[PDB]
Amino acid sequence: AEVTQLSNGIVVATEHNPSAHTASVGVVFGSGAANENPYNNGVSNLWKNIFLSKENSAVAAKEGLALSSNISRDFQSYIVSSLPGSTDKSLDFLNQSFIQQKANLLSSSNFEATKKSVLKQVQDFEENDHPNRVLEHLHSTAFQNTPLSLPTRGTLESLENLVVADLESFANNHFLNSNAVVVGTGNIKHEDLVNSIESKNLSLQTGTKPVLKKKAAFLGSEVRLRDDTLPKAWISLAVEGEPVNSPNYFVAKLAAQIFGSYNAFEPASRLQGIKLLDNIQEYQLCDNFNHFSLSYKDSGLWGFSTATRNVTMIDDLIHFTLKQWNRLTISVTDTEVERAKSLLKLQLGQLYESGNPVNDANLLGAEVLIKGSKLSLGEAFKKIDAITVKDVKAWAGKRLWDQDIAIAGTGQIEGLLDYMRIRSDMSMMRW
Template sequence: MAAAAAVFRAGNAFLRARRPTLFAAKRFQGSVSYAQTVANIPETQLSTLDNGVRVATEESDHPTCTVGVWIEVGSRYENEKNNGVSNFLEHVVLKGTKKHSQLEEEVESLGAHLSAYTSREQTAYYMKSLAKDLPKAMELLGDLIQSSSPSEAETERGRKLILQEMHEMESNLEEVVFDYLHATAFQGTPLGYTVVGPTENIKSLSHSNLAEFMNNHYKAPRMVVAAAGGIRHAEVVGLARKHFGGVPFKYKNDAIPVLAPCRFTGSQILVRDDALPLAHIAIAVEGVGASSPDVVPLSIASTLIGNWDRTYGGGVNQSSRLAQISVENKLGHSFQSFNTCYSDTGLWGIHLVCDGLNIEDMLHFAQGEWMRLCTSVTESEVTRAKNTLKTHLVAQLDGTTPTCADIGRQVLSYGRRISLAEWNAKIDAVDAQMLRAVCSRYIYDKCPAVAAVGPIEQLPDYNRIRSAMYWLRL
């Protein structure tokens, strides 16, 4: 998601990363069935502290654990003048506190790993360590969230680091084209902002801007302390009460931030650069929010379109029809279907990478597969996609860190963690008829958002792309 994006999207840094067994207790049972594995997943336990911080855990017998705090804040909570402040703040917070001025050395002395990320709707700080070091990890995270007081010099170092990262990101055309896609699809709204913000903002944001943003948004009811691995829920709750119980829950003048609706606009943004070797094209329709019941059918549809890279084996024997077509006609270098969900809206589409001369054909076949989803997809294809999606759901939770992240994101998005068994039941309830109906509702005859970067002279006119969003039928 963002939250369901994390569950379903086959493709924002942490969210696109690919993840021994779900449970160490089962690693010696090579014949354990999928149904048994799902049934044996420990229950996610959830408690709430007096100040509103939620504590959610999944216990296992791993020798390691991951604990983190997920906060309901990101670039969508920013405005045009301070866009980028969430990501800037995340970088500065990791510089340490007065109590832990040598943070990196402390973490390394434990053999642990501390990291963080910022997305459009969430910010997270998490730490993986030996299970016995859980108390130290919780103490470090609690101090970072509540006592971070970087000096002006540290703020400047953070500024230089972000500007350097922004320069490096320009070479990651996948990230670039997705930022452009958001910019055109949600133009004039906060979802159109990039997570890192524009260069001029990063250069002008002050130490006081960061402190003000943190005071306004790092509030207890918007936090989830999540933990997974060799931990016990009661211990985590006790440590959270000790280290996060002091997080404030009141807003100044009771001015609680409320997200404004972000409208979707069918439109395009094109950045032609013939010096680049390959064209990157992202095309999407408006998807659904994480809590929509249609998120599952749309995720199955995205899985059915699939993803492919020319380095894959299998050739024309790929399960994805679009992959078969790409191989047979030697069209693209890669493609990746995606279903990105935010709290109240989303993007459902595909990212294509191909030679400039193959753009028109790749778009033609991709949109043709979209129309087939709406009109003639078969039961066997849907069954195969459902099984693939179930496998992806299990694979994403392979380890304490992705499990912890899944807990944090889902509790922020849904108020609870939806179990794999419940996801599977939702998946099983979808048949070909339902899939065609849902796809027709969101894809058929809809105005898409298009972003393209590179040698895109052969990209069809927007009206032609729009006309391929329906089929003339007798």
């Protein structure tokens, strides 16, 4: 169960795991929905859907093998699951239908059907869903005029102005050989190490990825969509996280576990926890938490999110969460750090060791492109056992003391005071 890298034209990384028996070859691209300017937003989505429709229709009738994909910010994650002993067919299909040719798939009728399906899907996502809506709005507001804030799906206005030529140009400017790993997560050992190097298994347009000019930034802003028709509320605070490949990633993740998740409709969640959960339960202040610390190569975000049925006590929820964040950098009980360490160990163990090979393939590709070499979870355990209260205190004092916050919540938000009793209260306590 050891990961092996190399560099022979295309980086090939394998993580044998004899436990599961669903071999899943894959392809991962390091430039997704961030390295592209806002005027052509949904090109990655169009690629994703043309794949997932026509190639999914073809594969099963040809052989037996599913297929999936993903995109977060810079991840043309692109996976072809299979049986343990049919990976050569998977690579043959992947060669013959994804990198070449790109003309038989991009037919007019097929492209237009994909276009209308994507339009319908983005439309009803904008209508029905809500937490993901406010999350995308949070990203957009935190990175204004930065190639990081445009959504993964896109905007209908941007979608409507795409036919072929721009999709072809993106294909020729980001499907290179410089940044295209070939993941082999599953129960394959070395066939992936050799078959990936053949006569022509090499991406078209060898060259480099065109680097964007501006890097990133941060500045606080609101994109609220205040509308009283919807029943509940939604908020999403944020403070600038830690970028991947920094010696603060894991301590930030720990700071994103002391408070932890919550769900006020469970007998096993309303009762445990920390001081804020004791202080909230007296009334029905809130209805959900979600603490997270997202990180990307450009920069990272330390998240927060609720969905509160109560609409009049929003300010009290906000004030209590802010006081907890304020005092996280003044005094933390050592037992709190210990419990956070144990819980976070559990969370990473669950995430990295899911029985589904696709998620492991995704994460292996992510790390191998960004870090350059996978960091085994064992080293994660050893390097997290040494996180002491001094380190968390220092990191919190650096990242959470009078800092810009981005908030963008839909629903009924009129009870939320606008910006000064939501920011200048974030250090008011006499430290």
